[PDB]
Amino acid sequence: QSITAGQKVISKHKNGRFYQCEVVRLTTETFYEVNFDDGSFSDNLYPEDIVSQDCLQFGPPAEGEVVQVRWTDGQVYGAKFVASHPIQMYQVEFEDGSQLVVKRDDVYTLDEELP
Protein backbone atom coordinates (compact mmCIF):
# COMPACT_ATOMS: atom_id res chain seq x y z
CA GLN A 1 0.00 0.00 0.00
CA SER A 2 2.71 2.49 1.00
CA ILE A 3 5.18 3.63 -1.67
CA THR A 4 8.76 4.40 -0.64
CA ALA A 5 11.65 6.30 -2.17
CA GLY A 6 13.88 4.15 -4.37
CA GLN A 7 11.01 1.83 -5.32
CA LYS A 8 10.37 0.77 -8.91
CA VAL A 9 6.75 1.49 -9.76
CA ILE A 10 4.50 2.00 -12.78
CA SER A 11 3.02 5.37 -13.75
CA LYS A 12 2.07 7.50 -16.73
CA HIS A 13 4.96 9.21 -18.54
CA LYS A 14 4.33 12.70 -19.95
CA ASN A 15 3.65 11.05 -23.32
CA GLY A 16 0.52 9.56 -21.71
CA ARG A 17 1.42 5.87 -21.52
CA PHE A 18 2.26 3.69 -18.52
CA TYR A 19 5.95 2.89 -18.02
CA GLN A 20 8.09 1.61 -15.19
CA CYS A 21 9.62 4.51 -13.26
CA GLU A 22 11.45 4.92 -9.98
CA VAL A 23 10.34 6.99 -6.98
CA VAL A 24 13.08 9.63 -6.53
CA ARG A 25 11.65 11.31 -3.48
CA LEU A 26 8.49 11.82 -1.43
CA THR A 27 7.58 15.52 -1.52
CA THR A 28 4.98 17.62 0.25
CA GLU A 29 2.92 19.93 -1.95
CA THR A 30 0.85 22.66 -0.32
CA PHE A 31 -2.30 23.73 -2.18
CA TYR A 32 -4.40 26.79 -1.37
CA GLU A 33 -8.18 26.99 -1.71
CA VAL A 34 -9.91 30.28 -2.44
CA ASN A 35 -13.35 31.68 -3.29
CA PHE A 36 -13.14 34.19 -6.11
CA ASP A 37 -15.23 37.37 -5.87
CA ASP A 38 -17.70 35.98 -8.41
CA GLY A 39 -18.24 32.95 -6.16
CA SER A 40 -16.21 30.47 -8.23
CA PHE A 41 -13.96 28.14 -6.21
CA SER A 42 -10.38 26.98 -6.70
CA ASP A 43 -8.87 24.07 -4.78
CA ASN A 44 -5.34 23.96 -6.17
CA LEU A 45 -3.61 27.33 -6.07
CA TYR A 46 0.07 27.44 -5.15
CA PRO A 47 1.16 29.71 -2.29
CA GLU A 48 3.15 31.89 -4.74
CA ASP A 49 -0.08 32.60 -6.71
CA ILE A 50 -1.27 34.83 -3.86
CA VAL A 51 -0.04 38.28 -4.96
CA SER A 52 -1.47 40.45 -2.17
CA GLN A 53 0.97 39.00 0.40
CA ASP A 54 4.10 36.85 0.56
CA CYS A 55 2.85 33.41 1.57
CA LEU A 56 6.06 31.61 0.62
CA GLN A 57 7.73 33.75 3.26
CA PHE A 58 5.02 34.22 5.88
CA GLY A 59 2.71 31.25 5.38
CA PRO A 60 -0.96 31.14 4.37
CA PRO A 61 -3.39 34.02 4.78
CA ALA A 62 -5.90 33.97 7.62
CA GLU A 63 -9.07 31.97 6.95
CA GLY A 64 -11.54 34.27 5.19
CA GLU A 65 -8.93 36.95 4.45
CA VAL A 66 -9.31 39.07 1.30
CA VAL A 67 -6.56 38.26 -1.23
CA GLN A 68 -5.57 38.82 -4.84
CA VAL A 69 -4.51 35.83 -6.89
CA ARG A 70 -2.66 35.54 -10.19
CA TRP A 71 -4.63 32.96 -12.17
CA THR A 72 -3.44 30.51 -14.85
CA ASP A 73 -4.50 33.02 -17.49
CA GLY A 74 -1.91 35.44 -16.10
CA GLN A 75 -4.64 37.80 -14.88
CA VAL A 76 -5.25 38.99 -11.31
CA TYR A 77 -8.51 38.35 -9.46
CA GLY A 78 -9.96 39.32 -6.08
CA ALA A 79 -10.67 36.43 -3.74
CA LYS A 80 -11.09 35.23 -0.14
CA PHE A 81 -8.75 32.62 1.35
CA VAL A 82 -10.51 29.38 2.31
CA ALA A 83 -7.95 26.75 3.40
CA SER A 84 -4.47 25.33 2.97
CA HIS A 85 -4.03 21.66 2.03
CA PRO A 86 -0.68 19.78 2.17
CA ILE A 87 -0.55 16.63 0.02
CA GLN A 88 1.99 13.82 0.07
CA MET A 89 3.24 13.30 -3.49
CA TYR A 90 5.80 11.21 -5.38
CA GLN A 91 8.56 12.51 -7.59
CA VAL A 92 9.19 9.77 -10.16
CA GLU A 93 11.89 9.36 -12.79
CA PHE A 94 11.47 7.46 -16.07
CA GLU A 95 13.97 5.60 -18.25
CA ASP A 96 14.62 8.68 -20.37
CA GLY A 97 15.42 10.82 -17.33
CA SER A 98 12.15 12.77 -17.45
CA GLN A 99 10.46 13.42 -14.10
CA LEU A 100 6.95 14.03 -12.78
CA VAL A 101 5.45 14.78 -9.38
CA VAL A 102 2.36 12.62 -9.01
CA LYS A 103 -0.38 11.66 -6.58
CA ARG A 104 -0.57 8.31 -4.77
CA ASP A 105 -3.50 7.17 -6.94
CA ASP A 106 -1.45 7.55 -10.13
CA VAL A 107 1.24 5.13 -8.92
CA TYR A 108 1.01 1.36 -9.31
CA THR A 109 3.17 -1.42 -7.91
CA LEU A 110 4.73 -3.94 -10.32
CA ASP A 111 2.48 -6.76 -9.11
CA GLU A 112 -0.82 -5.02 -9.68
CA GLU A 113 -3.15 -4.98 -12.66
CA LEU A 114 -3.22 -1.71 -14.56
CA PRO A 115 -6.80 -0.52 -14.94
Numbering used by the authors: 897 to 1011
Sentences from the paper on this structure:
KDM4 (JMJD2) is a conserved iron (II)-dependent jumonji-domain demethylase subfamily that is essential during development. Vertebrate KDM4A–C proteins contain a conserved double tudor domain (DTD) and a potential zinc-finger domain at the carboxy terminus. From our biochemical and structural profiling, we find KDM4A, KDM4B and KDM4C DTDs display different histone-binding preferences. We show that these DTDs use an aromatic cage as a general mechanism to coordinate trimethyl lysine and, most importantly, the sequence specificity is largely determined by side-chain interactions with surrounding residues.
In all the structures, KDM4A-DTD forms two lobes (HTD-1 and HTD-2; HTD, hybrid tudor domain) with interweaving β-strands. KDM4A-DTD, which displayed strong binding to H3K23me3 as well, also bound H3K4me3 and H4K20me3, consistent with previous findings. KDM4A-DTD binds H3K23me3 peptide at low micromolar affinity (Kd=2.2 μM), slightly stronger than its interaction with H3K4me3 and H4K20me3, and KDM4C-DTD displayed highly specific binding to H3K4me3 (Kd=6.8 μM).
